[PDB]
Amino acid sequence: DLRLHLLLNTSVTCNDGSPAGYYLKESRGSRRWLLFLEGGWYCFNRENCDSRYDTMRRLMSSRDWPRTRTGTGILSSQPEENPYWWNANMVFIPYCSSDVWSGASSKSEKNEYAFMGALIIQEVVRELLGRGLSGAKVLLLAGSSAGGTGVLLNVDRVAEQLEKLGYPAIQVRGLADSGWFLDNKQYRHTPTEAIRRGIRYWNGVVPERCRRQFQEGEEWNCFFGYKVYPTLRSPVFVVQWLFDEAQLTVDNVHVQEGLRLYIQNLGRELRHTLKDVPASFAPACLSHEIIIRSHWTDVQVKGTSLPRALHCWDRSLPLKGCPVHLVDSCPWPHCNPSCPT
Numbered sequence: 001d002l003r004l005h006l007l008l009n010t011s012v013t014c015n016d017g018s019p020a021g022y023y024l025k026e027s028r029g030s031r032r033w034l035l036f037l038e039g040g041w042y043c044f045n046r047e048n049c050d051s052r053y054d055t056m057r058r059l060m061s062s063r064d065w066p067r068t069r070t071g072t073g074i075l076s077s078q079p080e081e082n083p084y085w086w087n088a089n090m091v092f093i094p095y096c097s098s099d100v101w102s103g104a105s106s107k108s109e110k111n112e113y114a115f116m117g118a119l120i121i122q123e124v125v126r127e128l129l130g131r132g133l134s135g136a137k138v139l140l141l142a143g144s145s146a147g148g149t150g151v152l153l154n155v156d157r158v159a160e161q162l163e164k165l166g167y168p169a170i171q172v173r174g175l176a177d178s179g180w181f182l183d184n185k186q187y188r189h190t191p192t193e194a195i196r197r198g199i200r201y202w203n204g205v206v207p208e209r210c211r212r213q214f215q216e217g218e219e220w221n222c223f224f225g226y227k228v229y230p231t232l233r234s235p236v237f238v239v240q241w242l243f244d245e246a247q248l249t250v251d252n253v254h255v256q257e258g259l260r261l262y263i264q265n266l267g268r269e270l271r272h273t274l275k276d277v278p279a280s281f282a283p284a285c286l287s288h289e290i291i292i293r294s295h296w297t298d299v300q301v302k303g304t305s306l307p308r309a310l311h312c313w314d315r316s317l318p319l320k321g322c323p324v325h326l327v328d329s330c331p332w333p334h335c336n337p338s339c340p341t
């Protein structure tokens with residue numbers, strides 16, 4: 001069980017003004033810290049956010065959160081479930097800002113909702129330092145779906161924050177799961193308009209080198225992995241199914257020659273954007289998310305599991321028998337026999 005702590009700085013809030021927070025399970029014999037960002041889409045205007053508040057309120061408010069949560073997958077403390085980091089200090093950060101972890105805007109008389117995802121990450125890091133993070137050797141910032149995009153937008157800011165506070169020995173790294181999307185043509189028209197409306201609504205913030213490349217009005221580009229990743233300085237491992245279900249939903253895909261070619265070309269383009277990503281894991285499967293799933297140990301690429309590939313990454317920071325770049329070449333979902341059923 002990880003235990004809930006609401007933030008001590010109560011001006012850092014979920015959408016509705018209630019305090020944000022984190023779940024923690026300490027491991028006093030370990031100098032490794034894992035901070036996981038939850039996902040869950042986003043909202044981009046008043047009417048859209050009001051609908052979310054009616055039926056997805058735990059993603060907008062801490063008022064109903066439970067006092068504990070079970071750690072699963074990479075957050076499990078059991079060696080049989082988590083061969084990678086079972087002895088680490090475990091942190092789960094709930095997503096209650098609906099801004100893909102980018103916002104830095106308070107509620108006020110002109111704003112019905114607060115969007116403070118980027119500040120929530122900073123405040124969690126600051127309060128953990130007094131609970132033992134000051135002694136860390138590695139801080140791994142991990143996240144799934146919207147949280148995986150949030151890793152890409154925030155890992156370098158966390159590195160900078162710890163450096164400016166006087167902790168230069170803590171190595172900050174990122175793990176982005178199912179957060180790597182393509183702004184491609186759809187199979188059928190109903191696109192990027194939602195994320196363009198949202199960044200304005202949230203006052204969203206993107207990494208500094210990427211904002212300087214794309215410049216004003218075009219910062220929405222930095223929410224797409226293949227465009228922001230080359231600008232990052234911290235080490236980042238990318239996990240992405242080649243046929244991701246949230247990608248295909250937005251593409252209006254639910255088999256004739258036209259659809260076959262469409263699907264095969266999506267997998268080829270995805271494989272192409274990962275070619276110069278040295279630490280990555282990308283199986284040829286139709287699925288979404290993996291790292292906090294209990295059976296995340298099961299899938300393999302070229303005979304290597306995801307927990308093994310992450311261990312090889314730790315060692316690298318080429319190794320005989322212990323690879324770190326694992327991308328499937330076969331062109332159709334579930335051409336890899338280890339795909340989840």
Ligand SMILES: COc1ccc(CNC(=O)[C@@H]2CCCO2)cc1
Binds near residue numbers: 100250
């Ligand atoms: C075809 O164009 C798209 C395909 C997939 C998505 C899904 N991803 C998101 O909506 C957010 C914003 C960007 C990163 O995550 C969005 C547009």
